[PDB]
Amino acid sequence: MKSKLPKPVQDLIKMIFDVESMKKAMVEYEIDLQKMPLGKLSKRQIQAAYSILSEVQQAVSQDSQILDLSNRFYTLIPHDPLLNNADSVQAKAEMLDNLLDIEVAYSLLRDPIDVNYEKLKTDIKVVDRDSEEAEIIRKYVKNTHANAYDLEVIDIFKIEREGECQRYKPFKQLHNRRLLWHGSRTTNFAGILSQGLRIAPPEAPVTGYMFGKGIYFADMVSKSANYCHTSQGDPIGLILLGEVALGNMYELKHSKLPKGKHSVKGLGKTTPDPSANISLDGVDVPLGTGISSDTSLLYNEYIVYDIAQVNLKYLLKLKFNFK
Ligand SMILES: CN(C)CC(=O)Nc1ccc2[nH]c(=O)c3ccccc3c2c1
Numbered sequence: 001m002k003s004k005l006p007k008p009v010q011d012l013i014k015m016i017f018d019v020e021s022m023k024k025a026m027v028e029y030e031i032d033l034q035k036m037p038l039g040k041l042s043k044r045q046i047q048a049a050y051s052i053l054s055e056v057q058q059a060v061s062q063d064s065q066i067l068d069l070s071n072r073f074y075t076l077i078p079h080d081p082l083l084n085n086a087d088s089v090q091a092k093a094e095m096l097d098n099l100l101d102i103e104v105a106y107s108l109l110r111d112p113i114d115v116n117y118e119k120l121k122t123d124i125k126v127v128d129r130d131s132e133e134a135e136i137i138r139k140y141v142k143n144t145h146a147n148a149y150d151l152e153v154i155d156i157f158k159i160e161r162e163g164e165c166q167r168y169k170p171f172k173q174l175h176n177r178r179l180l181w182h183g184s185r186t187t188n189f190a191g192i193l194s195q196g197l198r199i200a201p202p203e204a205p206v207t208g209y210m211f212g213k214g215i216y217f218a219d220m221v222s223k224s225a226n227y228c229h230t231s232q233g234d235p236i237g238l239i240l241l242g243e244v245a246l247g248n249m250y251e252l253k254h255s256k257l258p259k260g261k262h263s264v265k266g267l268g269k270t271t272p273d274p275s276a277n278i279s280l281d282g283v284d285v286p287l288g289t290g291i292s293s294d295t296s297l298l299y300n301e302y303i304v305y306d307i308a309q310v311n312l313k314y315l316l317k318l319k320f321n322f323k
Pocket residue numbers: 094097181182183184208209210216217218223224225227301
């Protein structure tokens with residue numbers, strides 16, 4: 001029966017639950033879809049591939065011994081590439097980080113649009129273009145952009161994740177609560193809305209993460225926009241905006257969080273203008289233009305090591321221009 005959901009929401013549900021986009025990504029990840037289809041994909045083997053990927057990372061102590069386990073990974077994950085380098089492990093690490101959010105997407109998936117919206121267990125409300133919050137969101141995109149592509153906001157959604165507010169409740173008393181970006185691939189978003197924003201498992205190798213396993217954020221929209229993996233063919237992507245209770249920040253230029261700190265701030269070369277900082281709802285919004293800050297980073301990085309420190313507030317349907 002005719003759904004009463006708005007068109008930008010209706011079209012977003014079609015986008016985040018696109019079966020063809022999932023199979024398309026599996027082809028691009030070189031995965032042999034004939035020996036392992038989309039359906040026969042299981043979490044039990046993804047987690048097993050990780051514990052074998054971390055064993056290749058263990059081959060730091062000691063070439064014939066490495067390839068005996070390197071090919072054993074290709075036994076679990078069919079491919080249609082020798083894993084000995086640290087770069088080779090990180091590449092397959094990002095693949096499994098993406099594959100798991102597709103296994104979650106197709107698990108939920110297996111009128112129809114209204115069932116899928118409720119399957120995600122989230123309230124997605126469209127934000128009007130004339131609203132005050134739309135100007136503040138559009139200014140944050142236009143001013144915190146670094147120039148190889150141009151960004152234009154197609155839609156703004158106020159996303160209310162089920163059971164996230166009561167989870168975020170104790171961290172709301174923390175100081176320095178900022179509104180930061182989290183960019184991810186269009187396919188992962190079905191899992192990001194149901195399970196939420198998560199941290200990498202202990203099975204996964206630590207080599208791939210600069211500041212260890214946690215939830216990574218940025219103040220510059222362009223930084224997170226690169227993690228959308230958008231091309232000339234399909235330029236539409238999805239980026240998030242979440243309330244991150246940072247509090248006591250551990251400022252790093254280059255173990256686990258000191259007794260007293262609550263977050264890590266990887267200092268960068270360029271920071272959004274602090275004299276142009278708006279404190280909307282008692283939450284800092286660094287929508288100023290990029291000014292200069294020894295630092296081994298592009299721009300600033302904000303990492304939290306507790307899933308509850310995050311409260312996903314907005315969602316943006318972005319269009320990418322290629323010059
Ligand atoms: C630490 N890594 C690059 C491995 C990885 O796949 N994680 C990952 C995965 C998704 C990420 N998304 C982001 O928006 C982001 C922003 C600033 C810094 C990092 C990220 C980010 C990082």
